[PDB]
Amino acid sequence: TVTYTNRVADARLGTFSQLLLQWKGSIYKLLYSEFLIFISLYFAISLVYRLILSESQRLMFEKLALYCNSYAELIPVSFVLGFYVSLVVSRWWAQYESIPWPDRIMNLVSCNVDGEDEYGRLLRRTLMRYSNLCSVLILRSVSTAVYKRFPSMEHVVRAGLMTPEEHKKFESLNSPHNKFWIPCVWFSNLAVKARNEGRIRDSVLLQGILNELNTLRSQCGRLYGYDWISIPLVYTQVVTVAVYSFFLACLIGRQFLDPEKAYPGHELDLFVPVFTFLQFFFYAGWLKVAEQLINPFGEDDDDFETNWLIDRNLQVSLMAVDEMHQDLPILEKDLYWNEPDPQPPYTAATAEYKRPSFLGSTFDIS
Amino acid sequence: TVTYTNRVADARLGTFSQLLLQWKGSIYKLLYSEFLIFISLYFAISLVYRLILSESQRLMFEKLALYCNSYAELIPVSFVLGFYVSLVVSRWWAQYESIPWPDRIMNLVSCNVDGEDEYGRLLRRTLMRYSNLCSVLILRSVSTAVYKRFPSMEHVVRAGLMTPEEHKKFESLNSPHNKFWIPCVWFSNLAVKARNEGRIRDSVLLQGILNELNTLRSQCGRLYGYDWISIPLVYTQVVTVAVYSFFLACLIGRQFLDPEKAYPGHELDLFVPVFTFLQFFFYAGWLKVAEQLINPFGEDDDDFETNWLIDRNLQVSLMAVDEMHQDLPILEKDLYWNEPDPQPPYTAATAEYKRPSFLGSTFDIS
Amino acid sequence: TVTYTNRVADARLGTFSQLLLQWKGSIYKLLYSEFLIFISLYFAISLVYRLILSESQRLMFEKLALYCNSYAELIPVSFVLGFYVSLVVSRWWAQYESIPWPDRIMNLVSCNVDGEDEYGRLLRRTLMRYSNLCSVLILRSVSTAVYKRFPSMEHVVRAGLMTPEEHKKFESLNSPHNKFWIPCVWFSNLAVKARNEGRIRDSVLLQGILNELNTLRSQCGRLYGYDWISIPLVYTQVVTVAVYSFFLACLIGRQFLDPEKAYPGHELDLFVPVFTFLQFFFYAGWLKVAEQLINPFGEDDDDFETNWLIDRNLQVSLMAVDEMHQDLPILEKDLYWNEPDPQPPYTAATAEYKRPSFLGSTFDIS
Amino acid sequence: TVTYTNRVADARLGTFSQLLLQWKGSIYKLLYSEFLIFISLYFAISLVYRLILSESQRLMFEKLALYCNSYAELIPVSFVLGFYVSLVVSRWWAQYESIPWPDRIMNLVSCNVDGEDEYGRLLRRTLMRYSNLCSVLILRSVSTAVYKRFPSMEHVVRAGLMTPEEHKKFESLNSPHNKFWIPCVWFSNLAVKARNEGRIRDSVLLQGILNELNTLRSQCGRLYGYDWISIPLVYTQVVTVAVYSFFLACLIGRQFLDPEKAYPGHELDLFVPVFTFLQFFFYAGWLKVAEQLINPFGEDDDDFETNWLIDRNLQVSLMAVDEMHQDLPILEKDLYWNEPDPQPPYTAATAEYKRPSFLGSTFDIS
Amino acid sequence: QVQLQQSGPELVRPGASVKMSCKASGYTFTNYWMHWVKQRPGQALEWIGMIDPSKSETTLNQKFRGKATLNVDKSSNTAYMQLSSLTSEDSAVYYCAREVYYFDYWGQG
Amino acid sequence: DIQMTQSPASLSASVGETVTITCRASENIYSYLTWYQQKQGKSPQLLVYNAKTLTEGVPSRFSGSGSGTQFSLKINSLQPEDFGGYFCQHHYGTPPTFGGGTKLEV
Ligand SMILES: OC[C@H]1O[C@H](O[C@H]2[C@H](O)[C@@H](O)[C@H](OCC(CCCCC3CCCCC3)(CCCCC3CCCCC3)CO[C@@H]3O[C@H](CO)[C@@H](O[C@H]4O[C@H](CO)[C@@H](O)[C@H](O)[C@H]4O)[C@H](O)[C@H]3O)O[C@@H]2CO)[C@H](O)[C@@H](O)[C@@H]1O
Ligand SMILES: OC[C@H]1O[C@H](O[C@H]2[C@H](O)[C@@H](O)[C@H](OCC(CCCCC3CCCCC3)(CCCCC3CCCCC3)CO[C@@H]3O[C@H](CO)[C@@H](O[C@H]4O[C@H](CO)[C@@H](O)[C@H](O)[C@H]4O)[C@H](O)[C@H]3O)O[C@@H]2CO)[C@H](O)[C@@H](O)[C@@H]1O
Ligand SMILES: OC[C@H]1O[C@H](O[C@H]2[C@H](O)[C@@H](O)[C@H](OCC(CCCCC3CCCCC3)(CCCCC3CCCCC3)CO[C@@H]3O[C@H](CO)[C@@H](O[C@H]4O[C@H](CO)[C@@H](O)[C@H](O)[C@H]4O)[C@H](O)[C@H]3O)O[C@@H]2CO)[C@H](O)[C@@H](O)[C@@H]1O
Ligand SMILES: OC[C@H]1O[C@H](O[C@H]2[C@H](O)[C@@H](O)[C@H](OCC(CCCCC3CCCCC3)(CCCCC3CCCCC3)CO[C@@H]3O[C@H](CO)[C@@H](O[C@H]4O[C@H](CO)[C@@H](O)[C@H](O)[C@H]4O)[C@H](O)[C@H]3O)O[C@@H]2CO)[C@H](O)[C@@H](O)[C@@H]1O
Ligand SMILES: [Ca+2]
Ligand SMILES: [Ca+2]
Ligand SMILES: [Ca+2]
Ligand SMILES: [Ca+2]
Ligand SMILES: [Cl-]
Ligand SMILES: [Cl-]
Ligand SMILES: [Cl-]
Ligand SMILES: [Cl-]
Ligand SMILES: [Cl-]
Ligand SMILES: [Cl-]
Ligand SMILES: [Cl-]
Ligand SMILES: [Cl-]
Ligand SMILES: [Cl-]
Ligand SMILES: [Cl-]
Ligand SMILES: [Cl-]
Ligand SMILES: [Cl-]
Ligand SMILES: [K+]
Ligand SMILES: [K+]
Ligand SMILES: [K+]
Ligand SMILES: [K+]
């Protein structure tokens, strides 16, 4: 979604440094408001101490700051963040791999549902759409980006993902629960009907198609699960309490105390707490990692591009089972027909990458 | 169960802060009693020191507090918590995914068990119920929420999850062990009988149905396993000992000592140990994460909604194999019939999400 | 094995505290001897310092204790423990899931091996026993609890897990290696013979049974692997060296030095090192977690109940393929026959758990 | 390979302590040389300081040691070790499970390749050998222990793992890459030829055999992968740099300084740095864990016993498909024929392990 | 056969306390929740509370919070109810019933 | 609490007749309603549960119906035995309040 994969292809001088200059889906964009509030509260307190408090009050503030500063402990906060963010990141990738792709059903339906006639065409296209509908229905249930595109079941129909007859059949089936599973049932029934009409040769080929469907159903189930079963609220609250506890301490503890009073650790007044602000970016930004990925189907810069996926899948699916049904290119003898050990060419820039075969560590390289 | 997934969809200003104002399944609700006892014990000790102890006793208490405070070490406690809670959270999600769903068997039984006659209907409905019974039986064995709804096998029958004949057959089978596996055997036998009556065409389709059953059996087995095999008691005790050791130290060590005596680290008396209480919420709350998820089938706010699952599955299962058997909507040409590269519309709010196809990192974006 | 799952079902006031009062499989029971030796050595040293050493020797001891105490570092020890115990706990659960269960083969053999005649019965029963024998043979190889029950192959026979003819055939096959794999070969051969006699209809059904067998074989292989391939000795030694290094330091370093000499950190003499003993329970107990689970097939309180599993499996297996072969209850119309949207009842105590269907995070709850 | 599984079966008094007295594959054996060099360098420096350096030089050395000692930081080193060793241990176990076992193919080939005639025997034996050859070829590519036993393809032949005709066919196939995949192709072809000759009944049984072959091929691929793709060199270097940095600091920093000069932290001179040496065993030994397991197919004490595996597999494979083809024991009625609820006996020592059935946590134990 | 046998009739003075019983038989005691109902002439049946025989978990009616107390004896298969600070209005017929999504078995009273 | 309003307070009919008692819920109680018969001096007896299902001994002349907040008991072809007390109870939650009752007189 915010792909910088190509920038970090090689480990050169500024591989990671360069990324500090990027705004989209960045630490700056996510921390902006919070940082400003922190900045404000800090310097506000700072001026109160420098310009308002009396000599006696200043002595209390200095004692208060020494107290607060002693409770700004990074080690405990770093612990809970690391473990929590790891959980979030784990679920994040699991949710991606749970986004259903038509390609596997697509390959089978395209080759195993017979007929070069309009019915055979309508059959294959309708099967794929039942798959894609099964997906779109669950996606608009878990993704705010998708839901805002399909707020009502009418939107689904008018967008061409569901026919008005299908919508009629949809409504006819009375159930208080999410009906995303309906198209998945239709598919299996239609696949069976197709086999009985002789459009699907064996049962071996039919079960194979039914299996790939079930897999897609399992995919939709995972998405439902991650959406339903949030990371326990108490856990989420714990890490924010820990993080905020730290910044609360810093607000007062990291204040620049009187240099004259010669407090151990506070010999220099820089007015601006450079390293404390750098710690804020570190920890608040670290928390923002979880904050953004805790729901990867939202509208964050780094949240998944689910609507593009829907579009891509629609186009590719139908194309593969329609225009590509039993439609192949002209079989030719390959360029290496009489060559048992082919030696494909290399461009000028890639010849260094033509390596001798790795036989194994145990063998002498001679 | 306590789903806040939609609140945390985007990473905005108060994404996580807002959650600190929630009571259901919160850190406040889980820590309430413990915190009060801590609060009490602290201020009790505090008054004894301020109002009761003699000047000489106060000096001993101050020396005792310095001793205790030096043993309040967060790093070791944070270690064991992180690793332990991770284990708990791991099992927690594993147990969820071990909750059996009918949908996969549901799809096969609905399309591959032939007959639009009362028997064909009774056949399909009875098969699904054998699956759902296999589930309900194991759930009431591991979930207190479910068991209190089905305390006796009579409850199961009267609720319509088991027929009195089935209950009779159930009792007839003499076994000292949990019989949750019985319906799973009935299913396989009934599926075979159905095939012999010609209601299931091939053996390929039959084995396919038998496989999805076995999968469901494996699901039930996992649930049994996690219920039977608790996290080793010694491990659980270790983390509570470590946690309590910390709070024991804090009870005395974090007492506000005489400011006059000028003890290094204790220059200010605030009467209320703000940061110590914040550490309590952090660590006691962190322990409460494990405390709540160590058995996700209990009656905690964040424990799984197993009874709803049972209800939902019952409704959907039967509906898909009965009302939906070989029952499809009217096949139409799709809205994109003559369109090879469909361009599904976007709402006004979601047009920004229409992206160009991601071809790969290596390609020049031109 | 030591199941406290029901005690920790809810996160109440004393959910974890209550477990500190339990003896079976507890931290107290596992640390008992070690703790006493520590206690003794400590107070022994303590008395030597208080009653034996001269004023000059006492000064050396005090300097020695300050030296030792500076090397009692929890952070490095906590690191290696956490990572090591995690490895142990990981293998621990992997080994459990590697304990073979008959249920999956059980379901297939019961329904797909035809015959209501004595031979059909003998056939099904013999097949299951070949599975259970394959298991018992590997279990008595890896579990000391099982081996002490079946120390010799004669015990296996006399217990009714193997016939004397089978034992004869067993011996006839000359091999220097563990023969646990033998019954698994017999099974596949007998399953094929059964198919040739017409007792198993298709090859689809036969391969399905052969597959579930292979799975069971893979289960037995995993058990063999974990038993054979121990956690590397050097790794185990490292963590004990680290742990013992810590307690060595504590033995001298944590001694209560002369209060009069006013050593920084040693202002108070309590005679009994409360927090040092609490650290012992923590770390020695943490090591005991690994100590107990490093071999979950032993005779520890929290080691697996493998013998019960063997008994349970024997009973259930045979019962399902014999008394339950093609034996079903009377098919009835279910209580929800004419009800498309069933509403199963709730007890008084569980009505709060009747929830509205969760449709998805994206949907407005109205 | 160094199995101490039985020693650590129970968690008794000296469960782990006992292992400190073991030499084979121990921390002592792996650290021996390194420790001696450390010992030497330390005491060498120590004598230079005590006997050679002048009063003025001694003051510089003391200032240098205080500098070095402040950089001996365990926390950062413990971090990188824990994460790195975890990676190593992870790959270590993955590589073990990637060692191919014949047993699954073995079971199928033994029962599904028909013929009690010399050809049927030759057929089954040749199939298994193609599997075992596929394994031996990859093992001698990744294991130095195996390669030194089969340094040349002639060794493979003379050992009876490959026929001279097979070796001829082997050479005839011109390819610059590792030919370990050849036997795996032969197998699939021979299995098909066997089916065409009517020795394999259905295609269902044939595909089943072809599948188990492919699985074995995937196993061989994993072994090749782990051998080819080493843990990134930079990562390995980082952890040794970190470790050595620590010991460099200790060499000077941990020197016993002048007691008279009364340096804070250096009040006692013991000549021998007990705890520093104990830290060496800890960290250098911790690194040795990775050092040994980074290549588990080498000749270390704790490296896998691949040659025994080869021998065992050869013996068992052929025996199961030859002497055991359609060869079963005499079918008898089992000892529990008329007993629905069998109660297998217990030895005197194991009666305590006869437990009541665990029904579930939710049920009242009455 | 399922049978709930309660104690005999009682007569007490105001302010005192009373404890009536209910012995269950013909079914597994611990697998069914025991309820208690109050019956006054002219008024509707009042639900006092329920008890889980297994763990002795009680759930009372807010209206009876300080008046009624429930507990059981799994060994003797009997349930008990105690009424305190008795007044003239506490005079009525008291039943104990078994629940299975309904009250299928009551005591004589 | 959920309020159970039963009507009529008392019904008078002769043998052979068909009467209909009605219980109405304060709030949705789905199909969670039970019908009891209680003859003067004796302890009540279960007639219908789950709004429709008849229990063991109850004769076919008894039937229940309804769902949500509106339920009703119907006794067709009365008998001499069918005369006495009749009340309802919801089973959705705690406390499971009872209906006012209905006296069926000849
Ligand atoms: O496969 C090989 C890779 O290598 C090349 O990419 C390079 C870029 O060419 C590098 O220029 C870039 O790093 C550059 C910066 C290096 C200075 C940091 C050194 C510090 C290291 C730590 C210790 C202190 C010193 C990394 C940034 C350092 C800044 C940090 C942040 C502030 C705090 C410290 C420093 C300099 O900034 C560059 O500046 C340019 C403008 O500012 C940016 O855009 C430019 O791209 C155009 C390309 O035509 C230019 O013509 C045009 O000038 C401008 O639009 C670059 O994107 C930006 O990276 O980052 C990459 C290094 O991997 C190549 O283009 C690609 O083929 C491929 O990505
Ligand atoms: O996708 C976009 C998302 O954004 C929006 O949600 C916002 C809310 O609208 C925000 O209002 C809310 O955050 C608000 C609070 C922010 C102040 C914290 C800033 C601190 C950051 C760290 C440094 C110090 C400053 C976050 C809470 C901060 C409190 C903490 C805890 C105490 C310690 C420090 C501060 C303010 O509290 C709000 O106050 C409201 C009342 O108090 C609550 O409920 C209200 O919802 C109604 C909606 O119609 C209102 O009309 C009505 O006033 C009231 O019922 C809100 O739920 C509650 O969040 O939280 C969300 C931010 O993500 C939008 O509604 C949704 O579409 C979606 O969830
Ligand atoms: O689903 C709801 C759950 O809740 C209930 O269980 C409760 C128990 O009823 C509680 O009593 C128990 O906790 C009790 C103890 C609490 C005091 C600790 C508070 C500290 C918290 C930290 C800060 C300081 C204060 C937790 C123990 C605290 C002790 C620690 C250890 C020493 C150091 C500090 C305190 C009290 O001890 C109890 O005492 C009882 C006797 O001592 C034990 O057994 C009793 O069970 C019988 C049941 O009929 C009793 O009749 C009989 O008295 C006796 O046999 C209990 O098992 C034991 O738990 O533990 C459970 C809390 O979850 C209920 O029974 C079950 O349905 C279910 O398990
Ligand atoms: O299932 C039950 C298990 O229990 C038994 O094994 C015991 C051994 O019998 C124990 O003897 C052994 O531990 C013994 C040592 C304990 C002293 C340590 C206590 C410390 C704990 C921390 C705090 C300080 C004190 C553990 C070693 C402690 C040494 C460390 C290292 C130095 C630094 C501190 C202490 C004593 O050493 C033993 O000494 C014996 C000789 O030295 C060794 O071999 C002997 O085995 C023969 C058996 O017939 C003997 O006859 C013969 O004497 C000799 O060959 C033993 O292997 C060796 O373990 O280790 C096992 C404990 O699990 C039993 O044999 C088996 O069935 C099974 O393994
Ligand atoms: Ca998001
Ligand atoms: Ca719970
Ligand atoms: Ca053990
Ligand atoms: Ca090695
Ligand atoms: Cl810190
Ligand atoms: Cl699913
Ligand atoms: Cl700063
Ligand atoms: Cl610490
Ligand atoms: Cl299973
Ligand atoms: Cl504080
Ligand atoms: Cl430390
Ligand atoms: Cl295997
Ligand atoms: Cl101490
Ligand atoms: Cl450090
Ligand atoms: Cl492969
Ligand atoms: Cl030292
Ligand atoms: K860089
Ligand atoms: K925030
Ligand atoms: K607690
Ligand atoms: K030990």
> Do residues B149 and E32 lie in contact, with contact meaning Cβ atoms separated by under 8 Å?
no
- Nearest partner of E66 among E17, E8, E14, E6, judged by Cα: E17
D28 lines ligand 4 (CB under 6 A): no
d(CA D130, CA D102): 10
Structure tokens at F68: 């949500």
For Cα atoms D227, D229, D230, give the angle at the middle one, nearest 5 degrees.
Answer: 80
Ligand 14 center from residue B347 Cα (angstroms):
54
CATH superfamily of E1-109: Immunoglobulins (2.60.40.10)
Residue B38 within any structural domain of the chain: yes
Range of the domain at D194: 1-332
B18 lines ligand 2 (CB under 6 A): yes
Residue C346 within any structural domain of the chain: no
Ligand 6 center from residue B300 Cα (angstroms):
5
> Do residues B112 and B201 lie in contact, with contact meaning Cβ atoms separated by under 8 Å?
yes
- C-contacting residues in D 131-190 (Cβ below 8 Å): none
Structure tokens at C224: 């063999």
Q: Residue B268: what are its φ and ψ, rounded to 5°?
A: -125, 135
Residue C343 within any structural domain of the chain: no
E33/C348 Cβ within 8 A: yes
**Backbone region of residue E16 per phi and psi (left: phi > 0; alpha: psi in -120 to 50; beta: other values):** beta
**Termini Cα distance of chain C:** 47
**Termini Cα distance of chain D:** 47
d(CA A194, CA A210): 12
d(CA C206, CA B206): 12
Residue C226's identity, in one-letter code, is: Y
β-pairing, F45-49 vs E93-99, is unpaired
d(CA C109, CA C200): 9
- Nearest partner of D300 among D145, D181, D81, D153, judged by Cα: D145
C345/F93 Cβ within 8 A: no
**Backbone region of residue D363 per phi and psi (left: phi > 0; alpha: psi in -120 to 50; beta: other values):** beta
d(CA A125, CA A316): 11
d(CA B178, CA B181): 8
d(CA C327, CA B333): 48
Residues 6+ apart with CB under 8 A from C325: B189, C110, C111, C113, C116, C120, C121, C124
D75 lines ligand 4 (CB under 6 A): no
| Gap from C27 CA to chain D (nearest CA, Å) | 11
β-pairing, F70-75 vs E103-106, is unpaired
> Do residues B116 and B326 lie in contact, with contact meaning Cβ atoms separated by under 8 Å?
yes
> Do residues D7 and D19 lie in contact, with contact meaning Cβ atoms separated by under 8 Å?
yes
- Nearest partner of C26 among C221, C292, C272, judged by Cα: C292
Domains and CATH numbers, chain F: 1-106 (2.60.40.10)
d(CA D197, CA D114): 10
Q: Measuring CA to CA, how many Å separate A92 from each of A22, A89, A95, A137, A138?
A: 22, 5, 5, 20, 17
d(CA C360, CA B6): 9
Query: Strands (DSSP E) along D5-146, which ranges?
Result: none
Count Cβ neighbours within 10 Å for each residue of A244-278 and write b for 16 or more, e otherwise. bbbbbbbbbbbbbbbeeeeeeebeeeeeebeebbe
Q: Which residues surround ligand 15, an ion (CB under 5 A)?
A: C 73-75
C363/A147 Cβ within 8 A: yes
C37 lines ligand 4 (CB under 6 A): yes
> Do residues D36 and D284 lie in contact, with contact meaning Cβ atoms separated by under 8 Å?
no
The single-letter DSSP state of residue B17 is G
List, as own/partner pairs, every contact residues D199-204 make where C-beta atoms lie below 8 angstroms and the sequence separation is at least 24, other chains included.
D199/D113, D199/D114, D199/D115, D199/D120, D199/D123, D200/D112, D200/D113, D200/D114, D201/C203, D201/D112, D201/D114, D202/C203, D204/C202, D204/C203, D204/C204, D204/C206, D204/C207
Question: Which neighbouring-strand residues pair with E59?
Answer: E50
Cis peptide before F8 (omega within 30 of 0): yes
Q: Which residues of A touch D224 (CB under 8 A)?
A: 360
Structure tokens at B75: 């790093």
| Gap from D332 CA to chain B (nearest CA, Å) | 24
Q: Is the Cβ of A340 closer than 8 Å to some Cβ of chain D? A: yes
In the complex, which subunits touch F with 3 or more CB pairs below 8 angstroms?
C, E
| Gap from B307 CA to chain E (nearest CA, Å) | 15
- Nearest partner of D361 among E100, B148, C27, B133, judged by Cα: B148
> Do residues D315 and C176 lie in contact, with contact meaning Cβ atoms separated by under 8 Å?
yes
- Nearest partner of C212 among D111, B214, D110, A214, judged by Cα: B214
F46/E104 Cβ within 8 A: yes
Residue C341 within any structural domain of the chain: no
Q: Token match 């309804």: residue?
A: F66
**Backbone region of residue B364 per phi and psi (left: phi > 0; alpha: psi in -120 to 50; beta: other values):** beta
Residue C110 within any structural domain of the chain: yes
CA within 13 Å, CB half, D64:
12
CA within 13 Å, CB half, B215:
16
Q: How many helices (H) and strands (E) does chain C have?
A: 13, 0
d(CA D174, CA C366): 72
Residues 6+ apart with CB under 8 A from D259: D266, D267, D268, D269
B278 lines ligand 2 (CB under 6 A): no
Structure tokens at D204: 């269902």
- Nearest partner of D209 among D100, D111, D319, judged by Cα: D111
DSSP D93-131: HHHHTTS--THHHHHHHHHHS--SSHHHHHHHHHHHHHH
For Cα atoms D17, D23, D25, give the angle at the middle one, nearest 5 degrees.
Answer: 100
A15 lines ligand 1 (CB under 6 A): yes
Count Cβ neighbours within 10 Å for each residue of D59-74 and write b for 16 or more, e otherwise. eebbeebbebbeebeb
Chain C's closest residue to F97, CA to CA, is C348
Ligand 1 atom nearest to CA at A12:
63
D11 lines ligand 4 (CB under 6 A): no
Residue E21: its H or E element: strand E18-25
Q: Which residues of C touch F50 (CB under 8 A)?
A: 345
**CB atoms closer than 10 angstroms to residue D86:** 15
- Nearest partner of C124 among C236, C199, C25, judged by Cα: C199
> Do residues B277 and B271 lie in contact, with contact meaning Cβ atoms separated by under 8 Å?
no
**CB atoms closer than 10 angstroms to residue B35:** 17
Ligand 2 atom nearest to CA at B20:
31
A31, A32, A34, A250, best to mutate for ligand 2 pocket (most atoms within 8 Å of CB): A34
Residue D339 within any structural domain of the chain: no
> Do residues D214 and D134 lie in contact, with contact meaning Cβ atoms separated by under 8 Å?
no
For Cα atoms A209, A213, A214, give the angle at the middle one, nearest 5 degrees.
Answer: 120
**CB atoms closer than 10 angstroms to residue D211:** 15
3-state DSSP call for residue C348?
helix
Residue D343 within any structural domain of the chain: no
Chain E's closest residue to B152, CA to CA, is E31
A356/D147 Cβ within 8 A: no
Residue B347 within any structural domain of the chain: no
| Gap from F92 CA to chain C (nearest CA, Å) | 6
- C-contacting residues in B 70-109 (Cβ below 8 Å): 70-71, 73, 75-76, 79-80, 82-83, 87
| D-to-E residue pairs, Cβ atoms closer than 8 angstroms | 5
**CB atoms closer than 10 angstroms to residue F19:** 17
**CB atoms closer than 10 angstroms to residue D116:** 9
A174/C341 Cβ within 8 A: yes
d(CA C346, CA F93): 8
Structure tokens at C76: 């490095």
B312 lines ligand 2 (CB under 6 A): no
E107/F34 Cβ within 8 A: no
- Select from B154, B156, B158, B161 the residue whose CB has the most chain E CBs within 10 Å, as the one to mutate to test that interface: B154
CA dihedral A267, A272, A274, A276 (to 10 degrees): 80
Cis peptide before F95 (omega within 30 of 0): yes
Residue B138: its H or E element: helix B118-142
Q: Number of structural domains, chain B?
A: 1
What secondary structure, in 3-state letters, does C133-147 show? Answer: HHHHHHHHHHCHHHH
Residue B223's identity, in one-letter code, is: L
CA within 13 Å, CB half, A110:
19
B268/A66 Cβ within 8 A: yes
Count Cβ neighbours within 10 Å for each residue of C198-229 and write b for 16 or more, e otherwise. ebbbbbbbbbbbbbbbbebbebbbbbbbbbeb
Q: Which residues of D touch A363 (CB under 8 A)?
A: 141, 147
- Largest Cα–Cα distance of chain A, in whole Å? 97
Rounded (10°) angle between helices C274-293 and B233-253: 160
DSSP F45-94: EEEEETTTEE-SS--TTEEEEEETTEEEEEE-S--STT-EEEEEEE-SSS
d(CA C255, CA F50): 72
- Whose Cα sits closest to atom 14 in ligand 1? A14
Q: Is the Cβ of C362 closer than 8 Å to some Cβ of chain A? A: yes
Q: Measuring CA to CA, how many Å separate C80 from each of B74, B137, C202, C226?
A: 17, 43, 56, 22
For Cα atoms D216, D219, D224, give the angle at the middle one, nearest 5 degrees.
Answer: 130
- Nearest partner of A105 among A143, A132, A137, judged by Cα: A132
d(CA B115, CA C132): 39
Specified resolution (Å)? 2.8
Experiment used for this model: X-ray
d(CA C88, CA D86): 12
Chains C and B touch (3+ CB pairs under 8 A): yes
B357 lines ligand 2 (CB under 6 A): no
Residues, chain A: 366
> Do residues F103 and F9 lie in contact, with contact meaning Cβ atoms separated by under 8 Å?
yes
Start-end of H helices in chain A: 27-47, 55-69, 74-96, 103-112, 118-142, 144-147, 153-158, 164-172, 182-196, 203-228, 233-253, 274-293, 306-321
D328/C190 Cβ within 8 A: yes
Question: Which neighbouring-strand residues pair with E83?
Answer: E18, E68
Ligand 3 atom nearest to CA at B33:
21
d(CA F99, CA F92): 14
Chains B and E touch (3+ CB pairs under 8 A): yes
d(CA D96, CA A359): 20
Start-end of H helices in C70-163: 74-96, 103-112, 118-142, 144-147, 153-158
- Nearest partner of B105 among B317, B351, B279, B262, judged by Cα: B317
B177/D362 Cβ within 8 A: no
- Nearest partner of B75 among C13, E101, C78, judged by Cα: C78
Ligand 6 center from residue C346 Cα (angstroms):
21
Residues, chain E: 109
Ligand 4 atom nearest to CA at C33:
21
β-pairing, E93-99 vs E103-106, is antiparallel
Structure tokens at B1: 């169960």
- Nearest partner of B248 among B69, B81, B85, B82, judged by Cα: B69
- Whose Cα sits closest to atom 4 in ligand 3? C12
d(CA D95, CA D63): 49
> Do residues C296 and C95 lie in contact, with contact meaning Cβ atoms separated by under 8 Å?
yes
Q: Which residues of C touch B236 (CB under 8 A)?
A: 4, 8, 16, 19
